[PDB]
Design a protein around this ligand. Structure first.
Ligand SMILES: Cc1c(C)n(Cc2ccccc2)c2ncnc(N)c12
Ligand SMILES: [Cl-]
Length: 167
């Protein structure tokens, strides 16, 4: 039993809700919140900009030190950093950005990072400003993630389409 509330159950391990991931994280304080990161951990917009804003830019400060030490992530890769005031940990995961021409096949590799954590609060990878089809992202999530994932979908209209079209 965990404290996530109001989710629709899609499969044995995947749950979904129309919610603002920032507000969900502030309420639940999950062990892991997933950020929709880019390889430079520049948290300018989309989910990343919103999460970073909620940390009063502490996420960006920590991320800049991470990059200065380690260099950029790989597309499809991840790193674990602090969750600041939102969660114990933040798993920064880089899905492919279609608006940069990146290979959508890398979306499966991106979701594989979730399997290193027993329970996660997450957005749909590569959705939103990353330009992928969210219906496809949900399909890849369900077919790749085996650990318990709670998906927050900001847009109510999109949430309804994801549920109604879910096979
Ligand atoms: C700011 C923000 C963004 C861009 N997205 C991704 C997204 C948005 C619209 C359609 C699809 C995906 C979020 N997802 C969850 N919570 C959030 N606060 C956000
Ligand atoms: Cl985004």
């Amino acid at each position: 039993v965990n404290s996530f509330s109001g989710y629709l159950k899609l499969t044995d391990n995947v749950y979904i809700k129309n919610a603002d991931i920032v507000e969900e994280a502030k309420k639940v304080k999950p062990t892991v919140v997933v950020n929709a990161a880019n390889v430079y951990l520049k948290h300018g917009g989309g989910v990343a900009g919103a999460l970073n804003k909620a940390t009063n830019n502490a996420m960006q400060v920590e991320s800049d030190d991470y990059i200065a030490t380690n260099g950029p992530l790989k597309v499809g890769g991840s790193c674990v950093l602090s969750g600041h005031n939102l969660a114990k940990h933040c798993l920064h995961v880089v899905g492919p950005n279609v608006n940069k021409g990146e290979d959508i096949q890398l979306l499966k590799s991106a979701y594989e990072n979730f399997n290193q954590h027993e329970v996660l609060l997450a957005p749909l990878l590569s959705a939103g400003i990353f330009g992928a089809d969210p219906i496809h992202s949900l399909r890849v999530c369900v077919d790749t993630v085996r650990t318990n994932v709670y998906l927050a979908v900001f847009d109510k209209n999109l949430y309804d389409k994801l549920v109604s079209s879910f096979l």
